[PDB]
Structure formats: C-alpha cells, structure tokens
Amino acid sequence: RKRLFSKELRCMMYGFGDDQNPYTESVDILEDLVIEFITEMTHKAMSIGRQGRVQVEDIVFLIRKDPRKFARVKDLLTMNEELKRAR
Template sequence: MVNTNNKFDGAEYVSLYKATRVRDDHRFPNSSTGYLLEEKQEGTSVSLQNQLDYREFTDNMNKASAGSSSKVKEGSSHPSETSFKRKRGVFQKDLQHMMYGFGDDSNPLPETVALMEDIVMEYVTDMVHKAQDIASKRGKLLTEDFLFLIRKDLPKLNRCTELLSMNEELKQARKAFDVDEEKLAQPD
C-alpha cells in the first residue's frame, strides 16, 4: 500500500517496522529526530511520538545502521543490511555439504542454499549482537557469553562444550608437537 501524502499512520509504520527488523526496545542514537520506539509488555505494538516523514525515517535508519562495521553500536541489536549483503556466499560450500549430509541433493538449488545462508547469517548475527550486549557491561566478548545465550538449549550447549573441549585438546597437541619440533631443531 503506497501512501501518496508521504506521511504514514501506525499500521504502515508497523509493517515498515517488521520489514526492517528493528527490535521493540531499540532506541535510535539520533535523538534530534523526535521519534522513539517504546517496548510494550503485552504484544508487539509500537508507539510513535511524532508523525514522521517517510524519507526522514529511512534516512535516519540508514544513519543508525551506518558506520564502522567492526564495532557494534551501543543499544543496537539489528544487523546492518549493507554489511549483510556483502557477506553473501561465505557459507555456500559448507552449507551444501551440510545439506547433503542431512539428506538433500548433492547439488541443491542455488535458491535453497541462498535461503539457508540467509537464515544462518541472521542467526549468527543475532547471536553475536546479543553476546555483545551481554559483554558490553564487562568490556570484553568471551565464549562464555555465547554459552550463556544457549544455556536453555541443551543439545546446542552440549555440542558447543564438546567442540570447545576438542579445540582445547587440539591446541595442547599442537603445542606439544611444536615443542618437540623445536627440541629436534636445536643442536646439542
């Protein structure tokens, strides 16, 4: 539905809100615009302090998501659409192999792989942002922040702890191998 007067009402705002995947509790850093999203305890309704011009809203959304891609803005919990688009194809081969392992065709449709990659990227980005929010109080992101996020999902938690312990064993084995190699390289 297109509004011809460039102002939009609450229903259009809620659909725009869902399309941009902004969280209810997200507060935009630019307070001069006069808008504020408020979290509601019941439901997902969003209140708007002022009526906004659509262009102003989208410009401010772009400003809020722009900036350094390596740092997460304080209070921001949604992925930047531009940085999300740059990372296409990162997991393509791995996902094809995993999909084959779970019973899909050995050469799945590119659309299927792209959809799976979108889901994976959204999940990983969301988890990293949540972990960063937890770690912001302490100042440093640790693996325990991720374990804290999946603490209620026991299969994931068990698999992560198994992989972490296996990684630690591999580090110890590499360290022992490097020490033995250095001893052999030194003449007595």
C-alpha cells in the same frame, strides 16, 4: 552482498539428508539464516557480561533454548585441549 557460504553449505545440507545437488534458492535461504543467526547472537552477546565478545557469554544463550547447541559446544571446548595435548 555476495554469498560467502555457497559451496560450504551444499556440503552441510548433504550431511543432514537433503541431496547431492540442492537447489540454488534453498542455499539462498540457508545462507541468510546463518548471517542473521551470527548477528542475533552477537548483538545480544555484547550487552551480557561486558561490552566485548568473550566466549563465556556465548555459552549462556545455548542453555534453556536448545540443549543440542550446548552439548555440542562442550565438545568443541574439551577437544581443543585434547588436540593440544597431542602436540
């Protein structure tokens, strides 16, 4: 595997207080957390609801585990409609 999140993740670590120039072996770690996080929220999402990937079951795991992932997914679903109402 190559790194599909090498330049994007360096902007994000700067966004949360790291540095303007993070180490390469620290973006090596964070790039493998995200690929496992998307895998271990899709392998468990294809057994709940139905054997597909509708987003009405992505919102189930975010409650009762961490409320920040739920309060930041209700903002991305509300603002999808306020950005199509403007057109």
